[PDB]
Swiss-Prot record, chain B:
It comes from Nitratiruptor phage NrS-1. This is DNA Primase-polymerase. homohexamer. The chain holds residues 636 to 718 of 718 of the full protein. The gene is 28. It comes from the Viruses. Multifunctional protein with primer synthesis, DNA polymerization, and DNA helicase activities. Recognizes a specific sequence motif 5'-TTTGGTTA-3' and initiates DNA synthesis.
Length: 409, 83
């Protein structure tokens, strides 16, 4: 009966509206003035009526799959499936390259990294890559330290720049919510640790190819992941950081802005008015692609790790490394002061750690002394030697007598 | 530390007049022998904490400084060097 299956599509394109049926979401999509919405059929029929004066029974539009592919065009076709793009660049994403960064913006950035070019520049190279290439980095930045260091200002600054493609000030509460639209179509995702660790999920988000997106009144849907994560915190460790970590750059900043020379009142606002300037700068970076996903052992990251990691691990590692110095650094020499051991035995005890051959009665003496109360061989085995594979419990003949000892290796 | 009752170390004879000078000197100079660090932190907090603990729960998380040997009165001493 119908002559054209897409007449309505075209007539609405004539008027600068692009309508489609999104087979994946079973929802009609609509695109005007770089704003994308998804609406049910009735809602579309109501829009169509207003624009052509006829409510057709049949919505004569193409079936596409909406997909947030920033690099890809307005539309494409992989294999045989027609896709349509949900990424539309914001104003300050489409802006002309420059080589100079606005000076008052630069002072913020300098202030924030405590004037350390290495890490600061690395963050610009990250931020640039996100801006320019619009992919997932596989690294995240934690900014901790006291308030008013312009962590929050950096967020507003960028928020102005990425507009909708960024989520701001996402909290633990938002995560406990069953929905999670703060990851739908987001190049940047900012989090605010607040209570003075449920964000460990984020670890996987940084590197996962895809996310599940539960949105209200929409189908749970799996999507390609373009997220990059910043986390603001104020002296509280938001995430359990492994010693050997490759995801997190950590940047302590305690340079309050209101304690600097350069800070006027109009500074706060001035910074934000230079968003375009800072966009322009970012657009003109020449991106080292190998440095994007680089992480560094900042002073703060080290402090976080050496407090997060288990003391029993640290003992075991000192036993393994045959590292007397550590034990002395942690006050083993106090064994001699309290006359738990004599001058002779103390030589034997140090010898034992270094040689990596430790008599039971010295092991117990060491672990009692480091930890502050006495632990049995059994405990020390089950909670140090055994889980961290320090070595084996065995016999060795020391002097003539056969001695129960732990043999490192 | 004096505002929070460190001077109580002297009352209970945990330390003598001589050592008490060394202990105050140590805080100010920012060079603290293990046995004084423990004495301080025991005294402020009310029960004795090991060097290990004090490292893991004070020095290390709040980046107070590092533990290095310093010779004091000839003997080499384990100390916390503020900075
Ligand atoms: Mg929010």
């Amino acid at each position: 009966e119908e002559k054209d299956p897409l007449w309505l599509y075209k007539v609405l394109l004539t008027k600068g509206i692009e309508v489609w049926f999104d087979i994946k979401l079973e929802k009609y999509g609509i695109k005007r003035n770089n704003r994308v919405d998804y609406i049910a059929k009735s809602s579309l029929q109501q829009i169509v009526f207003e624009i052509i004066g006829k409510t057709p029974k049949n919505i004569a539009v193409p079936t596409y799959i909406g997909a947030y592919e920033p690099s890809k065009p307005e539309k494409w076709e992989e294999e045989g499936i027609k896709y349509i793009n949900l990424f539309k660049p914001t104003p300050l994403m489409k802006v002309k390259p420059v080589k100079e960064m606005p000076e008052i913006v630069k002072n913020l950035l300098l202030n924030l990294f405590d004037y350390d070019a290495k890490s600061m520049g690395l963050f610009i190279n990250w931020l640039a890559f996100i801006y320019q290439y619009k992919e997932r980095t596989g690294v995240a930045w934690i900014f901790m330290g006291k308030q008013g260091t312009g962590k929050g200002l950096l967020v507003d600054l960028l928020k102005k720049i990425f507009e909708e493609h960024m989520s701001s000030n996402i909290t633990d509460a938002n995560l406990d919510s069953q929905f999670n639209p703060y990851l739908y179509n987001k190049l940047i995702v900012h989090l605010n640790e607040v209570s003075a660790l449920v964000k460990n999920r984020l670890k996987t988000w940084i590197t996962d190819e895809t996310l599940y997106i539960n949105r209200k009144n929409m189908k749970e849907v799996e999507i390609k992941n373009f997220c990059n994560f910043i986390i603001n915190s104020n002296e509280t460790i938001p995430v359990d950081i492994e010693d050997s970590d490759r995801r997190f750059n950590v940047i302590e900043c305690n340079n309050v802005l209101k304690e600097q020379e350069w800070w006027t009142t109009e500074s706060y606002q001035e910074i934000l008015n230079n968003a375009e300037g800072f966009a322009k700068y970012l657009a003109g970076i020449k991106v080292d692609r190998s440095k994007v996903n680089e992480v560094v052992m900042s002073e703060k990251k080290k402090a976080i790790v050496e407090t997060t990691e288990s003391v029993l691990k640290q003992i075991a590692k000192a036993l393994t490394d045959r590292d007397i110095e550590w034990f002395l650094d942690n006050g083993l020499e106090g064994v001699v002061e309290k006359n738990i051991v004599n001058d002779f035995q103390w030589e034997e005890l140090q010898e034992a750690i270094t040689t990596g051959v430790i008599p039971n009665k010295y092991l117990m003496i060491i672990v009692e002394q480091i930890l502050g109360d006495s632990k049995t061989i059994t405990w020390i085995k089950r909670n140090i030697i055994t889980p961290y594979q320090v070595g084996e419990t065995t016999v060795v003949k020391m002097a003539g007598k056969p001695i129960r000892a732990i043999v490192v290796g």
